Design a protein around this ligand. Structure first.
Ligand SMILES: [K+]
Ligand SMILES: [K+]
Ligand SMILES: [K+]
Ligand SMILES: [Mg+2]
Ligand SMILES: [Mg+2]
Ligand SMILES: [Mg+2]
Ligand SMILES: [Mg+2]
Ligand SMILES: [Mg+2]
Ligand SMILES: [Mg+2]
Ligand SMILES: [Mg+2]
Ligand SMILES: [Mg+2]
Ligand SMILES: [Mg+2]
Ligand SMILES: [Mg+2]
Ligand SMILES: [Mg+2]
Ligand SMILES: [Mg+2]
Ligand SMILES: [Mg+2]
Lengths: 87, 122, 92, 273, 65
RNA sequence: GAACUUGAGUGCAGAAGAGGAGAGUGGAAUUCCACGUGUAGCGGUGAAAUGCGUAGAGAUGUGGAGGAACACCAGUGGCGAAGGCGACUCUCUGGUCUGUAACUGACGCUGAGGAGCGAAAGCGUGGGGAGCGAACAGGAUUAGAUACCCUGGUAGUCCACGCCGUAAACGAUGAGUGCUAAGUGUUAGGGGGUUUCCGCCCCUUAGUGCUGCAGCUAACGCAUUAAGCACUCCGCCUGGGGAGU
């Protein structure tokens, strides 16, 4: 467990001090879980059930990224640079 | 945002009243329906949601409704825009069509007069 | 948090009994475990024979390790001729 | 892993090779090399006593430590190297006291791994112990038959034997062949499968590559003449045309068992392959 | 019927607690049904696990008479 | 453009689970091998015979080797998108449910093509091979018997990696959302009664069943887990053959 990743990408674009539901925070946590799960699948190549989990996370993260991009174009660009995404 | 099915379903089982999530046009439909004699009153409450108040349409105050056999149909997401000239009449009278206008609604005379056919109901 | 129960072969002197138990405690502690409790159930009649041993000395240990320790317990417990059974259960 | 070449010529079609992924250096330890001339299958009389051996690439011998007799001194795996003299790869061990030796590279072994020999060693891949010290079910390789002589059995790429049981002076061992056999419990063995397990999958691809490995063409008996082989002669092609297929020296060569009846080792062979 | 675990207020069944597990096996050693014992579904799962761990390390028998 | 929190997510606190991947481990039974005891049958069928047995079978006792599947628990029980998933343990890992509403503020639904997963059989390479058993052989049966029955038995069934992409892959019922009598089981929760709990009772969420209103239906039947009343999007049908050629 890491609230580290919360308090980092809360404060970058914080609505509240104890913001949790910011797209920033969500996308960041998704990015952390995605990347963790990828390295599981490097080892456990034929864990297909878990891999469907990955594809759902990826789809959530994409949809939240498309949401920012349409909402706040600058705020989107700051998030993808810090996480190191492309889209 | 379909009050009509909510009405139909309750009307079928001769319900006394029903609580429909309120919206401006669903409010403005219920009053068009009330022109006959449904709704007695509603209870506007402290707004948390934008429609928690509901419409509280009460067409069955007594055991049996004097106005029974309520029926609607023409509500598709494919948009059906009526000409002021060619506004239909439900059952050749004995039924109304809520023709959404910029300024007007209801009968055939309230089309060439009022103008925008817009939405069309039954 | 893990409980490690293990049976020792009954043909064991109390000197060599301690020698086994102290070695397998050192397997845990040296590999980054903290033994947070022990227990001795003593000699018991086994429900079924194993390795021609009708009875055996049961031996519980509780640890708060991170896996690698209690993994290293197993591979040594399997190798050893003195431990006749063992389990590792995660605690609730 | 096996690297498949693309069919850029008829020679290359079907040919596959090791990727040599495990190999960590290209240069052997000079102090552990010895000269090795080819022999052409010719004995001390100068006569050809084994057929189909001849030519191939020049090779230096790497002196392998099959004995594993630096007991108690730990050794660090410094390299994994190609050895042209055998199917397995070899590992240069740097011993703590500055002695360097080569061993057979077991499956798994990594540069930096510590290895250890002797009766008070762990059952880790690359260690070597007297068989009396190795638990039942342990996969082993480089098994001695005589104490101190050095490992003779189960040395080729990917091979392995399992320890089955202990009879005091003897230990039962299932050999790679599947033969179960008694081995003196004082005989050492090395822990693990021999590496380079993919060796058998190599498709040699072309005639010339066999020639690089010192194999000369095999001529079938049935295209020789009667003075050369029992299958020789006949007009046109001929079937074997004999009670049994025969060797070039007139023994039956299909099913005929050649282990010496009254072998001394028969008492130690529990189950034949 | 009444559940032994729900009634007595037991929220955790040790595999090592032998005397308890002997109440929920036959003479032969077979795990007793919910119909006979009257235990809850959740505890019957927890119990079964405990039986099977016990059998692994010879606390209880697989088969015996 | 500005708001909002009911949708949809996040956080926080609980819950259950044969969800998946990897490594190790256990007991029962079958088979084979060895050995002790013992001796004429065993086995099999509708009835037989081929088989296996005096080179000592079958039975019985003990030990060894090996493979596969996990009694009891076990339940219109659970989990999973479906296919599926059932000994135990650890490692890694996916989802769901409940509660709380701190946070986000339509971020949603569906989804041709595309990509992935996908029982069994089959295929490739390399393993493994107890039991079972296409083919194949023998014994019967029969008019015949290229079957059913019997005795054997190869591939295969198992493992790793790759391929194949189909099943009455079924609820013969696409997904999402809302709405529309009741009664009764059961799985995992939650809240609240008088009560010290247990227990009983009331309420409630999400599953899983049965019965049954209205409505629907050609009928059979479906019926809050709709085949009812609605809206969105996708897939598909248009007489039988010919031909899924
Ligand atoms: K070629
Ligand atoms: K030839
Ligand atoms: K010839
Ligand atoms: Mg030759
Ligand atoms: Mg010639
Ligand atoms: Mg001749
Ligand atoms: Mg001839
Ligand atoms: Mg001819
Ligand atoms: Mg299509
Ligand atoms: Mg298959
Ligand atoms: Mg195959
Ligand atoms: Mg048969
Ligand atoms: Mg089909
Ligand atoms: Mg099915
Ligand atoms: Mg179908
Ligand atoms: Mg979808």
């Amino acid at each position: 467990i890491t609230q580290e990743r919360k308090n980092q990408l809360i404060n970058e674009f914080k609505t509240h001090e104890s913001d949790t539901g910011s797209p920033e925070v969500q996308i960041a946590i998704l990015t952390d879980s995605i990347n963790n799960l990828n390295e599981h699948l490097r080892t456990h190549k034929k864990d297909h059930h878990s891999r469907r989990g990955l594809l759902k996370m990826v789809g959530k993260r994409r949809n939240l990224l498309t949401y920012l991009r349409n909402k706040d174009v600058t705020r989107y660009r700051e998030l993808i640079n810090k996480l190191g995404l492309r889209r | 945002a379909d009050m009509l099915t909510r009405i139909r379903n309750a009307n079928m089982v001769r319900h006394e009243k029903l609580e429909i999530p309120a919206s401006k046009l669903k409010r403005e439909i219920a009053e068009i329906l009330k022109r006959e004699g449904f709704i007695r009153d509603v209870e506007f409450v402290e707004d948390s949601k934008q429609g928690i108040i509901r419409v509280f349409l009460k067409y069955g105050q007594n055991n049996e409704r004097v106005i029974t056999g309520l029926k609607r149909i023409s509500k598709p997401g494919l948009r059906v825009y009526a000409k002021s000239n060619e506004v239909p009449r439900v059952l050749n009278g004995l039924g109304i069509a809520i023709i959404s206008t910029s300024q007007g609604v209801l009968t055939d005379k309230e089309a060439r007069a009022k103008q925008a056919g817009g939405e069309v109901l039954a | 948090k893990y409980e490690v129960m293990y049976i020792i072969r009954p043909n064991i002197d109390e000197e060599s009994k301690k020698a086994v138990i102290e070695r397998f405690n050192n397997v845990l502690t040296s590999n980054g475990a903290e033994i947070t409790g022990t227990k001795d159930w003593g000699k018991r009649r086994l429900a079924y024979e194993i390795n021609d041993f009708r009875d055996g000395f049961y031996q519980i240990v509780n640890v708060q390790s991170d896996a690698a320790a209690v993994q290293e317990f197993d591979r040594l417990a399997k190798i050893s001729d003195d431990i006749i059974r063992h389990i590792v259960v995660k605690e609730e | 892993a096996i690297k498949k070449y693309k069919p850029t010529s008829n020679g290359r079609r079907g040919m596959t090779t090791s990727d040599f992924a495990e190999i960590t250096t290209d240069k052997p330890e000079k102090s552990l090399l010895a000269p090795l001339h080819k022999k052409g299958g010719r004995n001390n009389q100068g006569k050809l006593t084994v057929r189909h051996q001849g030519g191939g690439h020049k090779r230096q011998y790497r002196v392998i430590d099959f004995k594993r007799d630096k007991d108690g001194i730990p050794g660090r795996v410094a390299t994994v190297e190609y050895d042209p003299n055998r199917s397995a790869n070899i590992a240069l061990i740097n011993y703590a006291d500055g002695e360097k030796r080569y061993i057979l590279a077991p499956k798994g072994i990594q540069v930096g791994t510590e290895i250890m020999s002797g009766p008070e060693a762990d059952i880790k891949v690359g260690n070597a112990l007297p068989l009396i010290n190795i638990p039942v079910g342990t996969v082993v390789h480089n098994i001695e038959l005589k104490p101190g002589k050095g490992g003779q059995l189960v040395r080729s790429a990917g091979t392995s034997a399992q320890v089955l049981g202990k009879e005091g002076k003897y230990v039962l061992v299932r050999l790679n062949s599947g033969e179960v056999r008694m081995i003196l419990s004082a005989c050492r063995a090395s822990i693990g499968q021999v590496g380079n397990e993919q060796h058998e999958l190599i498709n040699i691809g072309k005639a010339g590559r066999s020639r690089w490995k010192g194999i000369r063409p095999t001529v079938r008996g049935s295209v020789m003449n009667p003075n050369d082989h029992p299958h020789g002669g006949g007009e046109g092609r001929a079937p074997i045309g004999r009670k049994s297929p025969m060797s070039p020296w007139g023994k039956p060569t299909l099913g005929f068992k050649t282990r010496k009846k009254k072998n001394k080792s028969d008492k130690f062979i529990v189950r034949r392959r | 019927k009444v559940c032994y675990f729900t009634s007595n207020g037991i929220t955790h069944i040790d595999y090592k607690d032998v005397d308890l597990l002997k109440k929920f096996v036959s003479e032969r050693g077979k795990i007793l049904p919910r119909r006979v014992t009257g235990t809850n579904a959740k505890y019957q799962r927890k119990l079964t696990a405990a039986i099977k761990r016990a059998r692994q390390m010879a606390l209880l028998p697989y088969v015996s008479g």
